[PDB]
């Protein structure tokens, strides 16, 4: 049966979550049966990101998709240019890779107020290095020694085997390509089965999303 | 009830050592992090260190030299064990399952206070 769509879609469950997962560990959360209004969610806050891929940016607030999947996480600021179709790096190689006919947006702000700490706030990490790269929305949580080079580890940290889990540290003072950002990656499902996910009836053109 | 549960923790001297232990109701909460984690006074919540499904660890960069985490995986309990510590290492202690995971995914414990003086 086709579902009901009235109550307004819980971006704030997402977008204002206290504390962000760690980019290797990722965090998805399914958004299903409700009305995703753009306009509101774009002047919710400041964004230092926000750019669509696949879908017409100006029509949002008509477009249907029987899912949106919102993956949210932190990563510093000189890396947020690796969540796009088609990008390489520590993030887009090992850590959180969007495909190449990615459909969706991307949504990123400077969370220095909330995530760097004098001394510094070491609680976020990242995934330095894997034996391949990750297949579009994997999520690797292993912990297993990466031989870096040619001596065997035989599942032993130490000389060229490497734990694969790293600190950020974030400080208010870094410059701001090593301040964090919060981000927050929304993925549209486009299966042949009915919408549960569908903008506003009476909907202005989702038109702010141009002039940034 | 209650699923993750602290114990240890009380009065420490400076410079004294304390053995902190958490017991898990199931070994699932292991898959795939179970953390320590603190909150001083006047402070921001203070990842310690985690232990992976793997029995691997990864501490803080910034306090590795004063502490260790270890699991007994028969009794589902994972400790934390801190040496050399200073008043501002008095705070909450609490055991927390999947941190990484952000706070919409994450499992926490009720924590223990561990308070340092003379």
């Known amino acids: 049966r086709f579902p009901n769509i009235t109550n307004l879609c819980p971006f704030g469950e997402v977008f204002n979550a206290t504390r962000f997962a760690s980019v290797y560990a990722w965090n998805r959360k399914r958004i299903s049966n409700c009305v995703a209004d753009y306009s509101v969610l774009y002047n919710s806050a400041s964004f230092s990101t926000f750019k669509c891929y696949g879908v017409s940016p100006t029509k949002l607030n008509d477009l249907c998709f029987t899912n949106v999947y919102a993956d949210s996480f932190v990563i510093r600021g000189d890396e947020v240019r690796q969540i796009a179709p088609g990008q390489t790096g520590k993030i887009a190689d090992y850590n959180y890779k969007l495909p190449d006919d990615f459909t969706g947006c991307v949504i990123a702000w400077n969370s220095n107020n909330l995530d760097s700490k004098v001394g510094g706030n070491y609680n976020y990490l990242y995934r330095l290095f894997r034996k391949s790269n990750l297949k579009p929305f994997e999520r690797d949580i292993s912990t297993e020694i990466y031989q870096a080079g040619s001596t065997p580890c035989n599942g032993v940290e130490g000389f060229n085997c490497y734990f694969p889990l790293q600190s950020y540290g974030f400080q208010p003072t870094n410059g701001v390509g090593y301040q964090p950002y919060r981000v927050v990656v929304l993925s549209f499902e486009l299966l042949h089965a009915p919408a549960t996910v569908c903008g506003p009836k009476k909907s202005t053109e989702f038109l702010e999303v141009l002039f940034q | 009830e209650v699923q993750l549960v602290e114990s240890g923790g009380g009065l420490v001297q400076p410079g004294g050592s304390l053995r902190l232990s958490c017991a898990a109701s199931?070994?699932?909460?292991?898959?795939?992090?179970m953390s320590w984690v603190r909150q001083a006074p006047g402070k921001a919540l203070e990842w310690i260190g985690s232990?992976?499904?793997?029995?691997?660890?990864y501490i803080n960069p910034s306090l590795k030299s004063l502490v260790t985490i270890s699991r007994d995986n028969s009794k589902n309990t994972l400790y934390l064990q801190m040496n050399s510590l200073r008043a501002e290492d008095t705070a909450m202690y609490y055991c927390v399952s999947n941190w990484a995971s952000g706070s919409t995914g994450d499992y926490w414990g009720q924590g223990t206070l561990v308070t340092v003086s003379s």
């Open positions: 199931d070994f699932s909460f292991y898959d795939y992090e």
């Open positions: 232990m992976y499904h793997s029995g691997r660890t």
